[PDB]
DNA sequence: TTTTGTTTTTTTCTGTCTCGTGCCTGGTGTCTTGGGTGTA
DNA sequence: TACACCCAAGACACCAGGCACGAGACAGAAAAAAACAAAA
């Protein structure tokens, strides 16, 4: 399901960051990085989901998994 | 007919997406990818709407920061177009 | 579920009598307050454990603020905390 | 709260510091100091957000206003450097090399 | 300090290998840092679940969250074996 | 320590967890688990350091051996990313573009 | 006075050679000295804060370790 | 006969290998101690320092400088250059989050 | 010299803003005793 | 390390505006025309 993030979506994400021109080998590559990001967050949240004896990944687990890596997120407490 | 030059629409989109704070990634494909990734860690898992929204916001912010670092690395190399080498250098300097 | 939405709204009305706040902004302010609270509490606990002290007083909070907040923000927070302590003691 | 001249609660802060697994005992001036610091920070942030909203012709505070108020200030951005604000966006900053002419 | 324990562990894993004082201090600092990290993670996990008691499950979750992959798996297995041997 | 078959102290770890102000109550399996994890980590690090020392014809573990053992291992480098080892140095890594063409 | 000049050119050259730098320019030493001074000030501020919190007049190694840990530079071998 | 003279690039790599194989302190002790004392004097006058604290400070500063030099060399090689420039240091410190 | 981005000026409904208001929950006096600092 | 000392934790008894449920309305995005400097 890594092909869901279309190339124009990555183009918009780069335009938000101030990127003028984008090559062709960026999007797919970025996609992989995105996966890595999820592979560095969701699993941790899953661990939290495995600590409260629950089966639903709540927003608090995601907030704790993001804070535990230095990426503090607001507006979801 | 009118035809824009390769550079005006890029800056226009930059300004438009920097002025607005809307989500740039679609909800259904991102949710499907999140579920497929979480399935590899633990089977029979549920997700809330707030958790999916927080994950999407965090991923968008991380991608925006990575693209900013990539544009900085590309400008430092006397270039305008971004390359995967720029992203690799950014991820190596950041420690990822 | 307890939250500091009432106090944030009161502070906003104090600094801006004719200005509202959305729900997402309220949640962001709540998360910011919680993060600052946790950081200062952890720094104070570390400072108390480093000195073999089991009590956290205003000095530990002042040291935590001076270590976390940078420069003018730390100075203003220390001044406000000292003023509040003096007003509460009197 | 009323004795210290602060709108933030002192008893709630004391209870959170007692049950927060930080120390065996909590002093009487520590919750007052922490509430005063939190109130000062919240007042500064809310004043900056209200200024940004008045500059945007709006009587409400949105996450975009909070982001524009925090990222513009130097010390506030240094304090919240590793903080991600949801629905806040980024600063409209464009490099001079990408500009025409 | 953890000097005698680190020395015994080294003798168990390497019967013919010594250790200097600086290396011993580095090992003690690493042990203290891991102890502090795992204790903080366990305290956070206990506070998030409205629990006032830290058991082996909290330490296992802290190890799984801190240590990555095979290291976490092996540490969890060793901790479970030690717990089952101590409880028996 | 004798009942759990571990070299690390269990009573000392329990006392440290009780006096560290982490929770109101501490179970009997948590200190054993923490001591076992610490012992396994120490054993892995010491084995890697001894291997690095044997690769350098050395009988005593020096901080350079610990640095070579931590940096060469991927998991140990990921766990100790923001960790600085004193008198350990760095890895002898030279880029290919700097070599004489 | 003017102790920032203690980190002379050969010291910066050796520190660059340790990091794998082949060629060094001329304006590199000044920027390196400035960054080193900034980092030393940022660490010594927290060290002095930790020392004054203990009502002491001697900066021990534990204060430096705590100041480096609270920033993001965990250092080992100085806890004994 | 002309005396021996190494071309630009040999002794540089030799020193790179020598300083990457050894882990000795590259910064002198007395100037670094004087600089640390002068910096600490600006915050609080009449301050004492132990040998272990100064050694830890020197080790941390050397490690941070080595990491910054590695990042600077990476940024310089990325820009199709060999000699390092202050722009590379600025880019490294901006990406790392210091500026 | 002519086509296209950027700025000004009407209403009009439009998501939201403070007023009206009841329950109670957390917003105040008062006795005890005592352990954490104040000062030395 | 020692003698003193005084307001909080605990508990009893008494008391007041938040907060969500509606509503009339309030500044504004949009719909749309019209108009000036700069860009191609």
Numbering used by the authors:
A (entry chain b): 25 to 101
B (entry chain a): 38 to 133
C (entry chain h): 34 to 123
D (entry chain g), F (entry chain c): 18 to 118
E (entry chain d): 36 to 123
G (entry chain f): 23 to 102
H (entry chain e): 36 to 134
Study authors write:
RNA polymerase II (RNAPII) transcribes DNA wrapped in the nucleosome by stepwise pausing, especially at nucleosomal superhelical locations −5 and −1 [SHL(-5) and SHL(-1), respectively]. During nucleosome transcription, RNA polymerase II (RNAPII) gradually peels the DNA from the histone surface without histone dissociation, until it reaches the center of the nucleosomal DNA (the dyad DNA). Conversely, in the histone chaperone-independent pathway, the histone transfer from in front to behind RNAPII is proposed to occur via the formation of a template DNA loop, in which the upstream DNA exiting RNAPII rebinds to the histones within the partially unwrapped nucleosome downstream of the RNAPII. In the present study, we performed cryo-electron microscopy analyses of RNAPII–nucleosome complexes paused at a major nucleosomal pausing site, SHL(-1).
To avoid a shortage of upstream DNA in the DNA loop formation, we extended the upstream DNA region by 30 base pairs, and conducted the nucleosome transcription in the presence of Spt4/5 and Elf1. We then determined the cryo-EM structure of the Spt4/5-Elf1-RNAPII–nucleosome complex paused at the SHL(-1) position. In this complex, Spt4/5 and Elf1 bind to the RNAPII surface. Interestingly, the Spt4 and Spt5 NGN domains are located near the DNA exit tunnel and interfere with the kinking of the upstream DNA, observed in the absence of Spt4/5 and Elf1. Consequently, the upstream DNA orientation is directed away from the downstream nucleosome. Consistent with this, we could not find any structure containing an upstream DNA loop, although the binding of trans DNA (foreign DNA) to the exposed histone surface was observed. Elf1 may stabilize the Spt4/5 binding to RNAPII and contribute to the Spt4/5-mediated suppression of the upstream DNA looping. Consequently, the binding of Spt4/5 and Elf1 moves the upstream DNA away from the nucleosome and prevents the DNA loop formation.
